[PDB]
Design a protein around this ligand. Structure first.
Ligand SMILES: Nc1ncnc2c1ncn2[C@@H]1O[C@H](COP(=O)(O)OP(=O)(O)OP(=O)(O)O)[C@@H](O)[C@H]1O
Lengths: 128, 107, 530, 242
C-alpha cells in the first residue's frame, strides 16, 4: 500500500525460494541455447576471475557494450524463440478463453521494431 | 662557466693574447635548437678585441680558450649570457646559449 | 646445421651460396636434381603404380604486397592550376600496363580514394576498359606497355574525351564523349592513379615537340597543351605516404569528439565517440588519437595538498576513462612524441619503435645507457587487475609525467602500475590514446588532477603555469592519425652523381651544387614543413 | 606599444610560425637488403666502410650535412620506413635509421656526443667503418681505424637493413663495400662479412638513391606506384609436412 518492500536486501540475504523465480529465465535461456547444439566454453580469463571471486549504489551499465555480427544474428532467432514461448503461453490463454485473436499472435517477423522490445533487451542482455 | 667541444681542431699553438682583435665566424642557437644569431647569415666575420667587455662573458671566455683556426662549440649559461633579464625580443629570460664558433684570424 | 647463404662458397664460416629459393637456384644443380627426380618418378611410373597428378588449382594473391593498406598513389598538379574555361590536353604514358587511372580531378579530391569512385574525379581505367565517375561503366579499349593516353577536356561544352595512341576511345555505343554533363565548379586538374608496381609518366606539354600524339589528335581540334604558356615546370602534388596527426573533422564518418565543460564537482573532458558504430559500413580498426599540445621536459634533469609544493612542482597529470562496455584490451593509454607515424591495423606494445644508445668510456665500461622510443604507453586490458564489473567507475588510467626528471608513471584505478618509462631531457610528449571502437562510447580525456600534482594545462600553457585549476582551452583539441593529406614534390632535387671509379676505389658519390629550401615550423606540433 | 608587443611575443618562439633556411639532404644506398629472421639464411654480421674524399664545411650559411650509418625499412618493403622523401632529414632523423657524423650518434633526430680518439667532425681523408650485428642487435663505428666509444643496441629487428649515407651539397664520398667493389682500408672485425656478399646471384650491386624521385626532366620523370614487398629477400625454407 505504501510501496515499501523488504526485497532489496542483498541477494546473499534473499531466501532460496525467492531465488528460483530469477534463474527460471536463466535456466530457460540455457535450455534455448543448448537445444540448438551450441557448445559454450569458459576461457582462461573467466576461470581465473572465478578463482579470485541498503547497499552502496553500483549500477551495471549494460548499454554500451555491443555484440558481434554473427552473435547478433544468432540472438535474432533466439529472441524469436522467446517470442515463440510467449506465443505458447498466450495460446494456452486463447484455449482457456475460447477465442479472440490477440494483436501480437502474428509470427516474429510480423511485429514491428517497437513491438519487439522485450525480446531485445532480454536476449542481447544475457548475450552481453 | 663555459665548457668547449672542439668541432674541428686548430693549430693548438696560438691563443688570443691581451689587446688583440679576435676575428670569429659564429652561429648561436638556443638550447632547444632555434637559431637566433649567425655571422654566416650576414656573410661577415665578427671582430672583437679580447678582454675588453665588447661581447658577452661566455663568448669572451670561449674565444679566449679557443685556438687559431679551430672550430668549437660554446655553451654559455645564463649567468654568463644575458642573465635573467634576457635580450628584449630575442633571448628569453634564463636561457642557455650554444655557439658554433670558428676563430679565423687574430689581429 | 648452421649454414648460411652467401655470394661465394666458404666452408670455414659455414656459408653455402646454394641456400637460395629454388626459383633462384643455380642452373646446373637445378638440372641435375631435376633429371634425377624425373628419372626416379618416371621409373616409379614404369613399375605400374600410376601417379595421377592433381589438377593445377588456380590461385591469385591479387598482386597486393605493398606497404600496409596502401594500394595506389595519386599524382596531380597543384590546385592553383585548375582550369575553368577553354580546351586542354595532356598525355599519360603507361610504362607498365596494369591497374592505372588517369583523367581530371576537382580541387577537392581525397588522396586516399580511388579515382572516379566519387564525384571528385573523371578517370579512365584502361586496365579493365572502365570509365570512372561515381561508378564504373565500360568504355574504350585496354592499353598495353608503352601506350600513350591523351586526356583532353573542353570546358566550354563541359565534355571530356580520351585517346589511346591517337585513336579516340568510344562508349558502349559509338559516342565519342566520355563525360559530357558536369558543372565547372572549382575547375579541373590533371590526375593519375598508379597501382602496385605500376610506372607512369605525365607530359603536360611544356615542350610541344615532346608530345607524341597531340598533332595526331588534339592540335586541329582546338585543344591546347596544359602547360603551353607556362614559364616554369608545373608543381605536382602526390598523396602522402606517411600518416600525420590532424584535428578530427566535424563531418567525419565515424569519429565524433564532444567537448565537456568542467563543472564545480567535475573536470574538463574530451569525450570520443563513434558516429556510425553498429551500422553497416562500420569501421573496426585501431584509431590513433593524440592531444594537439605536448608536455616538454626540463632541459637539464635534476641530479588539502600544499599550495607551495603545488607551486614548486613540475609534475603534471591527465586521465583517460575507458567507458563501461569498451574492451580494455583494445585501449592503450600513454604518451607519444612527434616522431610517431606508425599506422598499423594491429598494434601491440612489443612492436613499437625503440633503440638503446649505449655510450661508454675508452676502456669500454658503459658509463650510461639511454633508451629511446616514440610510444610510451600501457595497455588498459593488462593494466586492470580486478576484472569483472568495472561499472563502479570507468577505467581511469592516470598518467603522471615528471617534467623535471623525465619519469613517466601510470596509475590505474588508484593503484600505481609497475610499468614506467624514462625519457630524455627536452622530450616533447603528446598525451595520446590508441583504441579500437567496440562500443559507440570509446573513451574520454578527463583533465583533472590527483593529490600534489599539477593539471595538464599548467604544463601545456605558459600563462596557466602557476594555475592549479584544470582548464581545457580551445587550442587543446583531439587529433587523430589519418592518411588524407597531400605532399608537394619539390621543383628541383639535389644533383647527385654516382659512378664506380674502379674495383679497388669503389663507388663515388659526388654532390656539389648547393640547394636550399626555407621551412615553416609549427611550435605546438614540433614539425616543420616547406 | 611597438616595444611591448615585440618584447612579449617574439622571444618565446612558441606562437608565431617560425622560418628557417635549410639545406636539402639526400641519401644514397646500395642494392643490399639484409635482415634477420628465424629459420632463414642470412648472415647476422655485416661490415662496410666509407671514405670521405672531400667535404666543404660550409658551402652555404648552414653547416654541411654528412652522416653515415645503417637504416631499416618498415616491414619487408624496399622503402625506408618512417622518413621524408625529401627535405633536410638524413641518417638518424628517425627511429628507423642510425647515423654517425664523427662527433655524435644520431637516432630519432636526437644527437648524443660520443667519445673517440681525436674527436672531429667528418673531414677530408677520413675513413668510417660501420659494423652491424643482427644476432644481438648492435651497431658500432670505427673512425680511421680507432673504435668509437658508442653503440646502438636493442633496436627493432623486423625489417631489411642496408648501408646508407646522408648528405647536403659539397661532398665527395666513396663506398668501400668489399670484394671487387672497393678494398677495405682496415680489416673487418672477426666474424663480420663484407656487404658485397649479400648481393643476389642475378642482381648486380649498385649505389642508388634511397628515394624514388631524382632531379631529371619533368616529362620524363617516372611516377612510381606502391612497390611489392621483398618476400624473396628472406629465404625461409618451409617444406610441406611429411
Ligand atoms: N654425391 C655427392 N657427394 C658429395 N656432395 C654431394 C653429393 N650430392 C650432392 N652433394 C652436395 O654437394 C655439396 C658438396 O660441397 P663440398 O663442400 O663437399 O664441396 P666443395 O666446396 O666444392 O669442395 P670439395 O671438392 O673439396 O668437396 C653439398 O651441399 C652436398 O650436399
Amino acid at each position: 500500500s505504501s510501496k515499501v518492500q523488504p526485497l532489496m536486501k542483498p541477494y546473499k540475504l534473499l531466501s532460496e525460494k525467492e531465488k528460483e523465480i530469477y534463474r527460471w529465465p536463466i535456466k530457460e535461456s540455457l535450455k534455448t541455447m543448448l537445444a540448438w547444439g551450441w557448445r559454450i566454453e569458459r576461457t582462461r580469463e573467466g576461470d581465473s576471475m572465478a578463482l579470485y571471486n541498503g547497499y552502496s549504489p553500483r549500477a551495471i551499465d549494460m548499454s554500451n557494450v555491443t555484440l558481434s555480427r554473427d552473435l547478433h544474428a544468432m540472438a535474432e532467432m533466439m529472441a524469436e524463440n522467446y517470442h515463440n514461448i510467449w506465443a505458447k503461453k498466450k495460446k494456452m490463454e486463447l484455449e482457456s478463453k475460447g477465442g479472440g485473436n490477440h494483436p501480437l499472435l502474428v509470427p516474429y517477423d510480423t511485429l514491428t521494431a517497437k513491438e519487439k522490445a522485450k525480446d531485445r533487451e532480454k536476449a542481447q542482455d544475457i548475450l552481453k | 662557466g663555459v665548457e668547449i667541444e672542439t668541432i674541428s681542431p686548430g693549430d693548438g699553438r696560438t691563443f688570443p693574447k691581451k689587446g688583440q682583435t679576435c676575428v670569429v665566424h659564429y652561429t648561436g642557437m638556443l638550447q632547444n635548437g632555434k637559431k637566433f644569431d649567425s655571422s654566416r647569415d650576414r656573410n661577415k666575420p665578427f671582430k672583437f678585441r679580447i678582454g675588453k667587455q665588447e661581447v658577452i662573458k661566455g663568448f669572451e671566455e670561449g674565444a679566449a680558450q679557443m685556438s687559431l683556426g679551430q672550430r668549437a662549440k660554446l655553451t654559455c649559461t645564463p649567468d654568463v649570457a644575458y642573465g635573467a633579464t634576457g635580450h628584449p625580443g630575442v633571448i628569453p629570460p634564463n636561457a642557455t646559449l650554444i655557439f658554433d664558433v670558428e676563430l679565423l684570424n687574430l689581429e | 646445421q648452421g649454414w648460411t647463404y652467401g655470394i661465394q662458397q666458404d666452408v670455414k664460416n659455414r656459408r653455402n651460396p646454394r641456400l637460395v629459393p629454388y626459383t633462384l637456384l643455380d642452373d646446373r644443380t637445378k638440372k641435375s636434381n631435376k633429371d634425377s627426380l624425373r628419372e626416379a618418378v618416371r621409373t616409379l611410373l614404369g613399375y605400374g603404380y600410376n601417379l595421377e597428378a592433381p589438377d593445377q588449382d588456380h590461385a591469385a594473391r591479387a598482386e597486393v604486397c605493398s606497404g600496409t593498406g596502401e594500394r595506389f598513389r595519386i599524382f596531380r598538379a597543384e590546385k592553383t592550376y585548375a582550369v575553368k574555361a577553354g580546351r586542354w590536353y595532356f598525355e599519360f604514358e603507361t610504362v607498365t600496363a596494369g591497374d592505372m587511372r588517369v583523367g581530371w580531378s576537382r580541387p577537392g579530391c581525397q588522396p586516399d580514394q580511388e579515382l572516379g569512385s566519387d564525384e571528385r574525379a573523371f578517370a579512365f581505367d584502361g586496365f579493365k576498359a572502365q570509365r570512372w565517375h561515381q561508378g564504373n561503366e565500360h568504355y574504350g579499349r585496354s592499353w598495353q606497355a608503352g601506350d600513350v593516353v591523351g586526356c583532353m577536356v573542353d570546358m566550354n561544352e563541359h565534355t571530356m574525351m580520351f585517346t589511346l595512341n591517337g585513336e579516340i576511345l568510344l562508349d558502349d555505343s559509338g559516342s565519342e564523349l566520355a563525360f559530357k554533363d558536369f558543372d565547372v565548379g572549382d575547375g579541373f586538374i590533371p590526375v593519375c592513379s598508379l597501382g602496385v608496381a605500376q610506372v607512369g609518366r605525365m607530359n603536360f606539354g611544356k615542350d610541344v615537340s615532346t608530345l607524341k600524339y597531340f598533332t595526331i589528335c588534339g592540335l586541329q581540334e582546338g585543344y591546347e597543351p596544359f602547360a603551353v604558356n607556362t614559364n616554369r615546370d608545373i608543381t605536382m602534388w602526390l598523396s602522402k605516404r606517411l600518416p600525420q596527426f590532424l584535428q578530427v573533422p566535424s563531418n567525419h564518418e565515424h569519429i565524433e569528439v564532444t567537448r565537456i565543460d568542467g563543472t564545480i564537482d567535475s573536470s574538463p573532458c574530451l569525450k570520443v565517440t563513434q558516429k556510425s558504430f553498429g551500422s553497416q559500413n562500420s569501421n573496426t580498426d585501431i584509431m590513433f588519437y593524440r592531444l594537439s599540445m605536448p608536455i616538454e621536459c626540463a632541459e637539464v634533469f635534476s641530479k588539502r595538498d600544499d599550495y607551495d609544493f603545488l607551486m614548486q612542482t613540475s609534475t603534471y597529470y591527465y586521465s583517460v576513462r575507458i567507458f563501461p562496455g569498451q574492451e580494455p584490451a583494445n585501449v592503450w593509454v600513454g604518451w607519444i612524441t612527434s616522431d610517431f607515424h606508425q599506422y598499423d591495423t594491429g598494434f601491440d606494445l612489443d612492436r613499437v619503435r625503440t633503440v638503446t644508445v649505449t655510450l661508454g668510456d675508452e676502456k669500454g665500461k658503459v658509463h650510461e645507457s639511454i633508451k629511446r622510443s616514440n610510444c610510451y604507453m600501457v595497455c588498459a586490458g593488462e593494466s586492470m587487475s580486478p576484472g569483472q564489473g568495472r561499472n563502479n567507475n570507468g577505467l581511469e588510467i592516470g598518467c603522471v609525467v615528471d617534467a623535471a626528471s623525465g619519469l613517466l608513471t601510470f596509475i590505474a584505478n588508484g593503484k600505481e602500475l609497475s610499468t614506467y618509462y624514462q625519457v630524455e631531457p627536452s622530450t616533447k610528449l603528446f598525451p595520446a590514446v590508441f583504441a579500437q571502437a567496440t562500443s559507440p562510447n570509446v573513451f574520454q580525456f578527463e583533465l583533472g588532477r590527483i593529490k600534489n600534482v599539477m593539471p595538464l594545462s599548467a604544463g601545456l600553457f605558459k600563462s596557466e603555469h602557476k594555475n592549479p585549476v584544470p582548464q581545457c582551452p580551445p587550442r587543446l583539441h583531439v587529433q587523430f592519425l589519418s592518411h588524407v593529406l597531400w605532399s608537394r614534390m619539390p621543383n628541383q632535387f639535389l644533383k647527385v652523381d654516382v659512378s664506380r671509379i674502379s674495383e679497388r676505389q669503389g663507388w663515388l658519390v659526388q654532390c656539389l651544387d648547393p640547394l636550399q629550401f626555407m621551412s615553416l615550423h609549427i611550435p605546438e606540433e614540433n614539425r616543420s614543413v616547406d | 606599444n611597438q616595444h611591448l608587443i615585440c618584447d612579449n611575443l617574439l622571444p618565446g618562439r612558441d606562437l608565431l610560425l617560425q622560418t628557417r633556411l635549410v639545406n636539402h639532404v639526400s641519401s644514397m644506398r646500395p642494392n643490399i637488403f639484409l635482415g634477420v629472421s628465424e629459420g632463414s639464411a642470412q648472415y647476422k654480421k655485416w661490415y662496410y666502410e666509407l671514405m670521405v674524399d672531400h667535404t666543404e664545411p660550409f658551402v652555404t650559411a648552414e653547416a654541411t650535412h654528412l652522416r653515415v650509418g645503417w637504416a631499416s625499412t618498415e616491414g619487408y618493403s624496399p622503402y625506408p620506413g618512417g622518413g621524408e622523401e625529401w627535405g633536410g632529414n638524413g641518417v638518424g632523423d628517425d627511429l628507423f635509421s642510425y647515423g654517425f657524423d664523427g662527433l655524435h650518434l644520431w637516432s630519432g633526430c636526437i644527437a648524443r656526443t660520443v667519445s673517440s680518439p681525436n674527436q672531429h667532425l667528418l673531414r677530408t681523408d677520413d675513413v668510417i667503418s660501420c659494423c652491424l650485428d643482427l644476432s644481438a642487435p648492435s651497431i658500432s663505428f670505427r673512425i680511421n681505424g680507432q673504435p668509437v666509444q658508442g653503440m646502438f643496441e636493442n633496436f627493432n629487428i623486423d625489417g631489411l637493413f642496408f648501408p646508407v649515407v646522408s648528405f647536403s651539397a659539397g661532398i665527395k664520398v666513396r663506398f668501400l663495400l668489399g670484394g671487387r667493389h672497393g678494398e677495405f682500408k682496415f680489416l673487418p672485425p672477426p666474424g663480420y662479412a663484407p656487404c658485397y656478399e649479400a648481393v643476389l646471384p642475378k642482381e648486380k650491386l649498385k649505389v642508388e638513391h634511397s628515394r624514388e624521385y631524382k632531379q631529371e626532366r619533368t616529362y620524363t620523370r617516372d611516377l612510381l606506384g606502391p612497390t611489392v614487398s621483398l618476400t624473396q629477400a628472406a629465404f625461409t625454407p618451409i617444406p610441406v609436412d611429411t
